[PDB]
């Protein structure tokens, strides 16, 4: 009962120069989809019933879920980048890009359809020239989801190595959304005002990033076999059925924060809804510098599952620590420059909707959860990142939601200034991964004892 | 005068049977053989045999999980034998 977690620190020898730092440039580009969202957010302010984002919100819902499913090939194609058939990774790449449709379609279809019931039983709302005019720009704001998957399937074939293009066609992305979002929300000659021609406009440029994929077979050697990518053999086509047990439980695990939804916003309004609701400059600026962080494991992820295929066993699972903690560096250094500062109401030209009279009982989980999970899921993003590992990550989060039961009404059930009160066993749900998760990672890190079935050959 | 095939890799098994995916970087004017004994020398030796870059294959794993010691064989231009490398890790 003392240490059922064996070798503690010894995810280590002398690795100091593990330059997993194209991984940064998975979130140097991935800041791109940050640095669009808020152009559309801070442009459709020239309409004040441009709370558009009300759609652009519960859109991400079915993108980011299904994006899980798709973030799933980040091993697939590294695992076989320890191979040679970049076309037998390709036949998969194609097979997913096909999938990339398929789902994107069937997803954007749920949107495409279901949407309407934005009014049911304990339910409804009615500024009609507002997002009712834009529930018809939920649709346009939706009709990429077919093409976005195919164009996030994009970075799943960045896996490999060259992450350069992703950086380009996202620096050549907010190249556009300004341009196109004005022209299509307003300044015509000729497409005047589908005013929330952000959703109309954004959706445009997916298709543009989409064939910012296509336009990068150009670079080196092929990953092109999209001749009628097909599905069938037995009951149903694998390298597709394969993509299932990886995909699924990362979306259904992205259903974590997809209920850090019903929580992060639900007791933002008791009888006290003031800066309690304003834990969005709280937990929106939580999310902002959370990506550059965590997104590196969703980038570490390659460096591993590939460096498994290249048969470098744990000559890589014992980098899945030297990454873990090279960001664990930043885990602290910017929780430091987190609780430290407060000036979210930057007074330059103006803000988006976050305004001046508020207390900063928010810097109080700029600590709590901020360094103590900075890491805690980039665990999986290397468990999957390496391995099968999200079959019990799905179930990693069987607690990270279902242990927030009263850690939901635990801000509202208090003894002190409990604003981070249900940030209870949800910043302690959140640190039951520094066990549960990485504790698993030095245990299955140590199947590279089981699988490295012969330490050292002749010379 | 040289060295072996080179690398040392059974990964594991389908319990009864086992993987054997070793260094064979290309082939030569080549051929392989793998020994198929355990580690007593009692239950005799057996000879799988293969060609291309193909030390990277697998067995017909016959019994439970006893200690099995299994060699692979180089062969090249002079119809003779680079050097064997060998290993025993059994289930
Ligand atoms: C996935 O949900 C989201 C997460 C973060 C953001 C970024 C927030 N932006 C800085 C915009 C300002 C925040 C704001 C809006 N829009 C907003 C924040 C959080 C919200 O609940 C999730 C919200 O309701 C949709 C609106 C203000 C007006 C209340 C938007 C999101 O969807 C709109």
Coordinates of C-alpha atoms and ligand atoms in Angstrom, one line a residue:
Chain A
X1 CA 0.0 0.0 0.0
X2 CA 3.1 2.3 0.1
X3 CA 4.2 2.6 -3.5
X4 CA 2.1 0.6 -6.0
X5 CA 3.9 3.1 -8.4
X6 CA 7.3 1.6 -8.7
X7 CA 10.2 3.6 -10.4
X8 CA 9.4 7.2 -9.5
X9 CA 11.9 9.7 -11.1
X10 CA 13.5 7.2 -13.4
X11 CA 11.8 8.4 -16.4
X12 CA 15.4 9.7 -16.7
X13 CA 19.2 9.2 -17.6
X14 CA 20.6 12.3 -19.5
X15 CA 18.1 13.4 -22.1
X16 CA 18.5 17.2 -21.7
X17 CA 18.7 17.7 -25.5
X18 CA 15.4 16.1 -26.5
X19 CA 14.4 18.7 -29.1
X20 CA 10.7 17.9 -29.3
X21 CA 10.3 21.6 -30.4
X22 CA 8.6 21.3 -33.7
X23 CA 6.0 20.3 -31.0
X24 CA 5.8 24.0 -30.1
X25 CA 4.9 24.6 -33.7
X26 CA 1.9 22.3 -33.4
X27 CA 0.8 25.2 -31.1
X28 CA 2.4 28.0 -32.9
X29 CA 0.0 27.3 -35.7
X30 CA -2.6 26.0 -33.3
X31 CA -2.6 29.6 -31.9
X32 CA -4.0 30.4 -35.4
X33 CA -7.5 28.9 -34.6
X34 CA -7.2 30.9 -31.5
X35 CA -6.3 34.1 -33.4
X36 CA -9.2 33.8 -35.7
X37 CA -12.1 33.0 -33.3
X38 CA -11.7 36.3 -31.6
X39 CA -11.4 38.4 -34.9
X40 CA -14.9 36.9 -35.6
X41 CA -15.7 37.5 -31.9
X42 CA -14.3 41.1 -32.0
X43 CA -15.7 42.1 -35.4
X44 CA -19.3 41.0 -35.0
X45 CA -19.3 43.6 -32.3
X46 CA -20.1 46.1 -35.0
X47 CA -23.4 44.3 -34.4
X48 CA -24.4 44.3 -30.7
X49 CA -26.8 41.4 -31.1
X50 CA -23.6 39.8 -32.4
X51 CA -23.6 37.6 -29.7
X52 CA -23.1 35.4 -32.7
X53 CA -20.7 33.3 -30.7
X54 CA -23.9 31.7 -29.3
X55 CA -23.7 29.5 -32.4
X56 CA -19.9 29.6 -33.0
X57 CA -20.1 28.4 -29.4
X58 CA -22.1 25.2 -29.4
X59 CA -20.7 24.5 -32.7
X60 CA -17.2 23.9 -31.3
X61 CA -19.2 21.4 -29.3
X62 CA -19.6 19.0 -32.2
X63 CA -16.3 20.0 -33.8
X64 CA -14.1 19.5 -30.8
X65 CA -15.8 16.3 -29.8
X66 CA -15.5 14.7 -33.2
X67 CA -12.1 16.4 -33.5
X68 CA -11.2 14.0 -30.6
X69 CA -12.1 11.0 -32.8
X70 CA -9.9 12.6 -35.4
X71 CA -7.0 13.7 -33.1
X72 CA -6.9 9.9 -32.9
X73 CA -4.6 9.4 -35.9
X74 CA -1.8 11.2 -34.3
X75 CA -0.5 7.8 -33.2
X76 CA -1.7 5.7 -36.2
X77 CA 0.7 7.6 -38.6
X78 CA 3.7 8.1 -36.4
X79 CA 3.4 4.4 -35.3
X80 CA 3.8 3.6 -39.0
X81 CA 6.3 6.4 -39.5
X82 CA 8.5 3.9 -37.8
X83 CA 8.0 2.1 -41.1
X84 CA 8.4 3.0 -44.8
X85 CA 5.0 2.7 -46.6
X86 CA 4.1 6.3 -46.0
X87 CA 1.5 5.2 -48.5
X88 CA 0.4 2.2 -46.3
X89 CA 0.3 4.9 -43.7
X90 CA -1.1 6.8 -46.7
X91 CA -3.8 4.2 -47.5
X92 CA -4.8 5.0 -44.0
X93 CA -4.3 8.8 -44.3
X94 CA -6.5 8.6 -47.3
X95 CA -8.8 6.2 -45.3
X96 CA -9.1 8.7 -42.5
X97 CA -9.4 11.6 -44.9
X98 CA -12.3 9.7 -46.1
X99 CA -13.4 9.2 -42.5
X100 CA -12.6 13.0 -42.3
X101 CA -15.6 13.4 -44.5
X102 CA -18.0 10.8 -43.4
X103 CA -18.0 12.1 -39.8
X104 CA -17.6 15.7 -40.6
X105 CA -20.7 15.2 -42.7
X106 CA -22.6 13.1 -40.2
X107 CA -21.5 15.6 -37.5
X108 CA -22.2 18.9 -39.3
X109 CA -25.4 17.0 -40.1
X110 CA -26.4 16.7 -36.5
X111 CA -25.8 20.4 -36.4
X112 CA -27.2 20.7 -40.0
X113 CA -30.4 19.2 -38.5
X114 CA -30.9 19.0 -34.7
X115 CA -29.9 22.7 -34.1
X116 CA -33.4 24.0 -34.5
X117 CA -34.5 22.8 -31.0
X118 CA -32.6 25.7 -29.6
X119 CA -36.0 25.8 -27.8
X120 CA -37.6 22.7 -26.0
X121 CA -39.0 22.4 -22.3
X122 CA -36.9 24.1 -19.5
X123 CA -35.4 25.8 -22.4
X124 CA -36.1 28.8 -24.7
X125 CA -34.9 32.4 -25.7
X126 CA -35.9 35.1 -28.2
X127 CA -33.8 38.1 -29.4
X128 CA -34.8 37.1 -32.9
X129 CA -32.8 39.7 -35.0
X130 CA -30.2 38.2 -32.8
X131 CA -28.9 34.6 -33.3
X132 CA -32.3 33.5 -34.7
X133 CA -31.2 35.4 -37.7
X134 CA -28.0 33.5 -36.9
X135 CA -29.4 30.1 -36.2
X136 CA -29.6 30.5 -40.0
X137 CA -25.9 31.3 -39.6
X138 CA -25.5 28.3 -37.4
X139 CA -26.0 26.5 -40.6
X140 CA -23.4 28.4 -42.7
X141 CA -21.3 28.5 -39.5
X142 CA -21.8 24.6 -39.6
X143 CA -21.6 23.6 -43.2
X144 CA -17.8 23.3 -43.1
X145 CA -17.8 20.6 -40.4
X146 CA -17.8 18.1 -43.3
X147 CA -14.6 19.8 -44.6
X148 CA -12.9 20.6 -41.4
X149 CA -12.4 17.1 -40.4
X150 CA -10.8 16.4 -43.7
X151 CA -8.7 19.5 -42.9
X152 CA -7.8 18.4 -39.3
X153 CA -7.1 15.1 -40.8
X154 CA -4.6 17.6 -42.1
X155 CA -2.4 17.6 -39.0
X156 CA -2.8 13.9 -38.4
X157 CA -0.7 13.8 -41.6
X158 CA 1.6 16.4 -40.4
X159 CA 2.4 13.7 -37.7
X160 CA 5.2 12.3 -39.8
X161 CA 7.5 15.2 -39.3
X162 CA 7.2 18.4 -41.4
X163 CA 4.8 20.6 -39.2
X164 CA 5.9 23.7 -41.2
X165 CA 2.9 23.9 -43.5
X166 CA 0.4 23.8 -40.6
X167 CA 2.1 27.0 -39.4
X168 CA 1.9 28.5 -42.9
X169 CA -1.7 27.8 -43.8
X170 CA -2.8 29.2 -40.5
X171 CA -0.6 32.3 -40.9
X172 CA -2.2 32.4 -44.3
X173 CA -5.6 31.9 -42.6
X174 CA -6.2 35.0 -40.5
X175 CA -4.6 36.3 -43.6
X176 CA -8.2 35.8 -44.8
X177 CA -10.9 35.8 -42.1
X178 CA -10.5 39.6 -41.6
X179 CA -10.8 40.1 -45.3
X180 CA -13.5 37.7 -46.0
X181 CA -15.4 38.2 -42.8
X182 CA -15.9 41.9 -43.5
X183 CA -16.8 41.5 -47.1
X184 CA -19.3 38.7 -46.2
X185 CA -20.7 40.3 -43.0
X186 CA -21.0 43.7 -44.6
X187 CA -18.9 45.6 -47.1
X188 CA -20.3 44.2 -50.3
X189 CA -19.9 44.7 -54.0
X190 CA -21.6 42.2 -53.8
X191 CA -22.1 39.9 -50.9
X192 CA -23.6 42.4 -48.4
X193 CA -24.8 41.4 -45.0
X194 CA -25.3 37.9 -43.8
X195 CA -24.2 40.1 -41.0
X196 CA -22.9 37.2 -38.9
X197 CA -20.8 36.5 -42.0
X198 CA -18.3 35.2 -39.6
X199 CA -20.1 31.8 -39.5
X200 CA -20.6 32.2 -43.2
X201 CA -17.1 33.6 -43.4
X202 CA -15.2 31.4 -41.1
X203 CA -16.7 28.3 -42.7
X204 CA -15.4 29.5 -46.0
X205 CA -11.8 29.3 -44.9
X206 CA -12.0 25.8 -43.6
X207 CA -12.4 24.7 -47.2
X208 CA -9.5 27.0 -47.8
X209 CA -7.3 25.3 -45.1
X210 CA -8.7 22.0 -46.5
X211 CA -7.1 22.5 -49.8
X212 CA -4.2 24.0 -48.0
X213 CA -3.9 20.4 -47.3
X214 CA -4.2 19.3 -50.8
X215 CA -1.8 21.9 -51.9
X216 CA 0.8 20.3 -49.7
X217 CA 1.5 17.0 -51.3
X218 CA 3.5 19.5 -53.3
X219 CA 6.4 19.5 -50.8
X220 CA 8.3 16.2 -50.7
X221 CA 7.1 12.6 -51.3
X222 CA 3.5 11.5 -51.6
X223 CA 0.9 10.8 -49.1
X224 CA -1.6 10.8 -51.9
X225 CA -3.8 7.7 -52.5
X226 CA -7.3 9.3 -52.6
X227 CA -8.3 7.2 -55.5
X228 CA -11.8 6.1 -54.4
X229 CA -10.6 5.4 -50.8
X230 CA -12.9 2.5 -50.0
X231 CA -14.4 0.6 -47.1
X232 CA -15.0 -3.2 -46.9
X233 CA -13.6 -6.7 -46.2
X234 CA -15.5 -8.5 -43.5
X235 CA -18.3 -6.9 -41.4
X236 CA -16.7 -3.4 -42.1
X237 CA -13.4 -1.8 -43.2
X238 CA -10.6 -1.6 -40.7
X239 CA -8.0 1.1 -41.1
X240 CA -11.3 2.8 -40.4
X241 CA -12.7 0.3 -37.9
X242 CA -9.2 0.6 -36.5
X243 CA -9.6 4.4 -36.2
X244 CA -12.6 3.7 -34.0
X245 CA -11.2 2.6 -30.6
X246 CA -8.6 5.3 -30.9
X247 CA -11.1 8.0 -32.1
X248 CA -14.2 7.4 -29.9
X249 CA -12.8 7.6 -26.5
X250 CA -10.8 10.8 -27.1
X251 CA -14.0 12.6 -28.2
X252 CA -15.9 10.9 -25.3
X253 CA -13.0 11.9 -23.2
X254 CA -13.2 15.4 -24.8
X255 CA -16.7 15.0 -23.2
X256 CA -14.7 15.9 -20.1
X257 CA -14.5 19.6 -20.8
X258 CA -17.9 18.8 -22.5
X259 CA -19.3 18.8 -19.0
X260 CA -16.7 21.2 -17.7
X261 CA -19.6 22.9 -19.6
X262 CA -22.6 22.0 -17.3
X263 CA -20.2 23.0 -14.4
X264 CA -17.8 25.7 -15.5
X265 CA -21.1 27.4 -16.5
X266 CA -24.0 26.5 -14.2
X267 CA -23.2 27.9 -10.8
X268 CA -22.0 31.1 -12.4
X269 CA -25.6 32.1 -11.4
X270 CA -27.1 31.6 -8.0
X271 CA -28.4 34.8 -6.3
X272 CA -24.7 35.9 -6.8
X273 CA -24.0 36.1 -10.6
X274 CA -21.6 39.1 -10.6
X275 CA -17.9 38.2 -11.1
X276 CA -19.1 34.6 -10.6
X277 CA -20.2 34.7 -14.2
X278 CA -17.0 36.6 -15.0
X279 CA -14.9 33.5 -14.4
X280 CA -14.7 33.6 -18.2
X281 CA -11.9 36.2 -18.4
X282 CA -11.2 33.6 -15.8
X283 CA -11.8 30.3 -17.7
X284 CA -11.5 31.8 -21.2
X285 CA -8.1 33.1 -20.4
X286 CA -7.7 29.8 -18.6
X287 CA -8.2 28.1 -22.0
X288 CA -5.9 30.6 -23.9
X289 CA -2.6 29.8 -22.3
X290 CA -3.6 26.2 -21.8
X291 CA -3.2 25.3 -25.5
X292 CA 0.4 26.4 -26.0
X293 CA 0.8 24.3 -22.9
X294 CA -1.2 21.0 -23.1
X295 CA -1.2 21.0 -27.0
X296 CA 2.4 19.9 -26.9
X297 CA 1.5 16.4 -25.6
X298 CA -1.1 16.4 -28.3
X299 CA 2.2 17.0 -30.1
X300 CA 4.4 14.9 -27.8
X301 CA 2.1 12.2 -28.8
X302 CA 3.9 11.9 -32.2
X303 CA 7.4 11.9 -30.8
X304 CA 6.4 8.8 -29.0
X305 CA 4.0 6.5 -30.9
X306 CA 6.3 7.0 -33.9
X307 CA 9.5 6.5 -31.8
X308 CA 7.7 3.3 -31.0
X309 CA 7.3 2.2 -34.7
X310 CA 11.0 3.2 -35.3
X311 CA 11.4 0.4 -32.6
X312 CA 13.2 2.9 -30.2
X313 CA 11.3 1.3 -27.2
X314 CA 11.2 3.6 -24.2
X315 CA 14.3 5.2 -25.7
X316 CA 11.0 7.3 -26.0
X317 CA 8.6 6.3 -23.2
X318 CA 11.4 7.7 -21.1
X319 CA 11.1 10.9 -23.1
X320 CA 7.3 10.8 -22.3
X321 CA 8.7 12.2 -19.1
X322 CA 11.4 14.6 -20.4
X323 CA 8.6 16.2 -22.3
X324 CA 6.1 15.8 -19.4
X325 CA 8.4 17.9 -17.3
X326 CA 10.1 20.2 -19.9
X327 CA 6.6 21.6 -20.0
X328 CA 6.2 21.0 -16.3
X329 CA 8.9 23.7 -16.3
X330 CA 6.3 26.0 -17.9
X331 CA 3.5 24.4 -15.8
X332 CA 4.8 26.4 -12.9
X333 CA 6.6 29.3 -14.6
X334 CA 3.2 30.3 -16.0
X335 CA 1.0 29.5 -13.1
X336 CA 3.5 32.0 -11.6
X337 CA 2.8 34.5 -14.3
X338 CA -0.9 33.5 -13.8
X339 CA -2.0 34.0 -10.2
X340 CA 0.6 36.7 -10.2
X341 CA -1.0 39.1 -12.6
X342 CA -4.6 40.4 -13.1
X343 CA -5.2 43.0 -15.9
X344 CA -7.7 41.2 -18.1
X345 CA -9.4 44.5 -18.9
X346 CA -6.5 45.7 -21.1
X347 CA -7.3 49.4 -21.7
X348 CA -5.8 49.9 -25.2
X349 CA -8.6 50.3 -27.8
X350 CA -11.1 48.2 -25.9
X351 CA -12.0 44.6 -24.8
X352 CA -14.6 42.0 -26.1
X353 CA -17.2 41.8 -23.3
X354 CA -15.1 41.4 -20.1
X355 CA -15.3 44.7 -18.1
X356 CA -14.0 46.7 -15.1
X357 CA -15.7 46.4 -11.7
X358 CA -14.8 42.8 -10.8
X359 CA -12.8 41.2 -8.1
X360 CA -10.0 38.7 -9.0
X361 CA -11.2 35.7 -7.1
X362 CA -10.1 33.9 -10.3
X363 CA -6.3 34.1 -9.9
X364 CA -7.2 31.5 -7.3
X365 CA -7.3 28.7 -9.8
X366 CA -4.8 30.3 -12.0
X367 CA -3.1 28.2 -9.3
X368 CA -5.5 25.3 -8.2
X369 CA -5.9 23.6 -11.5
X370 CA -3.4 25.5 -13.6
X371 CA -0.1 23.8 -12.9
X372 CA -1.7 20.7 -11.4
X373 CA -3.2 19.7 -14.8
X374 CA -1.1 21.8 -17.1
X375 CA 0.4 18.3 -17.3
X376 CA -2.4 15.9 -16.1
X377 CA -3.8 15.1 -19.5
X378 CA -0.8 15.5 -21.7
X379 CA -0.4 12.3 -19.9
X380 CA -2.9 10.6 -22.1
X381 CA -1.8 12.7 -25.1
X382 CA 1.2 10.3 -25.1
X383 CA -0.7 7.4 -23.6
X384 CA -2.8 7.5 -26.6
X385 CA 0.1 9.5 -27.8
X386 CA 2.1 6.3 -27.8
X387 CA -0.4 3.7 -27.5
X388 CA -3.9 2.3 -27.5
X389 CA -4.3 4.4 -24.5
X390 CA -7.6 6.1 -24.3
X391 CA -9.8 2.9 -23.9
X392 CA -9.5 3.7 -20.1
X393 CA -9.1 7.4 -20.6
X394 CA -12.6 7.6 -21.7
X395 CA -12.7 6.0 -18.2
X396 CA -9.9 8.3 -17.0
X397 CA -12.7 10.8 -17.1
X398 CA -15.3 8.5 -15.5
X399 CA -14.2 10.4 -12.4
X400 CA -13.2 13.8 -13.8
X401 CA -16.9 14.5 -14.4
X402 CA -18.7 11.9 -12.1
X403 CA -16.5 13.0 -9.1
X404 CA -17.6 16.6 -9.7
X405 CA -21.1 15.6 -8.5
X406 CA -20.9 17.7 -5.3
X407 CA -17.6 19.3 -6.4
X408 CA -20.3 21.0 -8.5
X409 CA -22.4 22.3 -5.6
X410 CA -19.4 22.8 -3.4
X411 CA -18.9 26.5 -4.2
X412 CA -22.5 26.7 -3.1
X413 CA -22.2 24.7 0.1
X414 CA -19.3 26.5 1.7
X415 CA -17.3 27.5 4.9
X416 CA -15.0 30.3 3.6
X417 CA -14.8 32.5 0.4
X418 CA -15.6 29.4 -1.7
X419 CA -15.5 30.7 -5.3
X420 CA -13.1 27.8 -6.2
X421 CA -15.2 25.7 -3.8
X422 CA -16.5 23.1 -6.3
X423 CA -13.1 23.5 -7.9
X424 CA -12.8 21.0 -5.1
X425 CA -12.7 17.4 -6.3
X426 CA -12.4 19.0 -9.7
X427 CA -9.0 20.5 -9.0
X428 CA -8.6 17.4 -6.9
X429 CA -10.4 15.3 -9.6
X430 CA -7.7 17.2 -11.6
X431 CA -4.8 16.0 -9.5
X432 CA -6.2 12.4 -9.4
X433 CA -4.2 12.0 -12.6
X434 CA -0.8 12.9 -11.2
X435 CA -1.7 9.4 -10.0
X436 CA -4.5 7.7 -11.9
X437 CA -2.9 8.9 -15.2
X438 CA 0.9 9.4 -15.1
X439 CA 0.9 6.6 -12.5
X440 CA -0.3 4.5 -15.2
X441 CA 2.3 5.9 -17.6
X442 CA 5.3 4.6 -15.6
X443 CA 3.4 1.3 -15.3
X444 CA 2.8 0.9 -19.0
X445 CA 5.9 2.9 -19.7
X446 CA 7.1 -0.4 -18.2
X447 CA 5.6 -2.7 -20.8
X448 CA 8.8 -1.4 -22.6
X449 CA 10.3 -4.1 -20.5
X450 CA 7.7 -6.5 -21.7
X451 CA 8.0 -5.5 -25.3
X452 CA 11.7 -4.6 -25.4
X453 CA 12.2 -8.4 -25.3
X454 CA 16.0 -8.1 -25.8
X455 CA 17.9 -5.2 -24.3
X456 CA 21.1 -5.2 -26.5
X457 CA 22.2 -7.2 -29.6
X458 CA 25.7 -7.9 -31.1
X459 CA 27.9 -5.1 -32.2
Chain B
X1 CA 35.4 -11.9 -40.7
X2 CA 32.3 -9.9 -39.6
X3 CA 29.4 -9.9 -37.0
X4 CA 25.8 -11.3 -36.8
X5 CA 22.4 -10.6 -38.2
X6 CA 22.5 -8.0 -35.5
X7 CA 19.4 -7.0 -33.4
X8 CA 17.8 -9.0 -30.6
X9 CA 14.0 -8.9 -30.8
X10 CA 11.2 -11.2 -30.0
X11 CA 8.6 -8.8 -28.9
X12 CA 6.2 -11.4 -27.5
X13 CA 3.6 -13.8 -28.5
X14 CA 0.1 -15.0 -29.1
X15 CA 0.9 -16.9 -25.9
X16 CA 1.3 -20.2 -27.6
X17 CA 3.2 -18.6 -30.6
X18 CA 5.6 -15.7 -30.7
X19 CA 6.9 -12.8 -32.7
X20 CA 10.6 -12.7 -33.7
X21 CA 11.1 -9.3 -35.4
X22 CA 14.9 -8.9 -35.7
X23 CA 17.5 -6.8 -37.5
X24 CA 17.7 -7.7 -41.1
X25 CA 18.5 -4.4 -42.9
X26 CA 17.9 -5.4 -46.4
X27 CA 19.0 -8.9 -47.3
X28 CA 22.1 -10.2 -48.8
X29 CA 22.7 -12.7 -51.5
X30 CA 20.9 -14.2 -48.6
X31 CA 18.9 -16.8 -46.7
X32 CA 18.1 -17.1 -43.1
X33 CA 17.5 -20.0 -40.7
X34 CA 16.2 -19.8 -37.2
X35 CA 16.9 -22.3 -34.5
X36 CA 14.0 -23.7 -32.8
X37 CA 15.1 -25.2 -29.5
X38 CA 14.4 -24.3 -26.0
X39 CA 17.4 -24.3 -23.6
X40 CA 17.8 -28.0 -22.6
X41 CA 18.8 -29.4 -26.0
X42 CA 16.5 -32.3 -25.2
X43 CA 13.4 -31.5 -27.3
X44 CA 15.4 -31.2 -30.6
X45 CA 16.2 -28.3 -32.9
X46 CA 14.0 -27.0 -35.7
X47 CA 14.6 -24.9 -38.8
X48 CA 12.5 -22.1 -40.1
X49 CA 14.0 -20.5 -43.1
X50 CA 13.6 -17.3 -45.0
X51 CA 15.1 -14.8 -47.3
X52 CA 14.7 -11.1 -48.0
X53 CA 15.0 -8.6 -45.1
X54 CA 13.2 -11.3 -43.2
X55 CA 14.7 -12.0 -39.7
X56 CA 11.7 -9.7 -38.9
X57 CA 9.2 -12.6 -38.9
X58 CA 7.6 -15.1 -36.4
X59 CA 7.3 -18.7 -35.3
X60 CA 4.8 -21.6 -34.8
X61 CA 4.8 -21.4 -31.0
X62 CA 4.2 -24.9 -29.9
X63 CA 4.0 -25.4 -26.2
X64 CA 3.3 -23.2 -23.0
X65 CA 5.7 -20.6 -21.7
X66 CA 9.0 -22.6 -21.0
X67 CA 12.5 -21.2 -21.8
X68 CA 13.0 -21.3 -25.6
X69 CA 16.3 -20.4 -27.1
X70 CA 16.2 -19.3 -30.6
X71 CA 18.9 -18.4 -33.1
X72 CA 18.8 -16.8 -36.4
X73 CA 21.3 -17.3 -39.2
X74 CA 23.1 -15.1 -41.7
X75 CA 24.1 -16.5 -45.1
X76 CA 25.6 -14.7 -48.1
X77 CA 27.7 -14.7 -51.2
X78 CA 30.1 -17.5 -50.3
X79 CA 27.2 -19.8 -49.5
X80 CA 28.4 -19.5 -45.9
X81 CA 27.3 -17.9 -42.7
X82 CA 27.9 -14.4 -41.6
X83 CA 27.4 -15.0 -38.0
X84 CA 24.4 -16.1 -36.0
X85 CA 22.9 -14.1 -33.2
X86 CA 20.8 -15.7 -30.5
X87 CA 18.3 -15.2 -27.7
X88 CA 16.1 -17.2 -25.3
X89 CA 13.2 -15.1 -23.9
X90 CA 10.3 -17.5 -23.9
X91 CA 6.6 -16.4 -23.4
Ligands
LIG1 C1 -16.7 26.6 -26.4 O1 -17.2 27.8 -25.7 C2 -16.4 28.9 -25.7 C3 -15.2 29.1 -24.9 C4 -14.5 30.3 -25.0 C5 -14.9 31.3 -25.8 C6 -14.1 32.5 -25.9 C7 -14.8 33.7 -25.3 N1 -14.6 35.0 -26.0 C8 -13.5 35.7 -25.3 C9 -15.8 35.8 -26.2 C10 -16.4 36.6 -25.0 C11 -17.0 35.7 -24.0 C12 -18.6 35.5 -24.1 C13 -19.0 35.6 -25.5 N2 -19.1 35.4 -26.7 C14 -19.0 34.3 -23.6 C15 -18.1 33.6 -22.8 C16 -18.5 32.3 -22.3 C17 -19.7 31.8 -22.6 O2 -20.2 30.6 -22.2 C18 -19.4 29.4 -22.6 C19 -20.6 32.5 -23.4 O3 -21.8 31.9 -23.7 C20 -21.8 31.2 -25.0 C21 -20.2 33.7 -23.9 C22 -19.2 36.7 -23.2 C23 -20.1 37.6 -24.2 C24 -20.1 36.3 -22.0 C25 -16.0 31.2 -26.6 C26 -16.8 30.0 -26.5 O4 -17.9 29.9 -27.2 C27 -18.5 31.2 -27.5

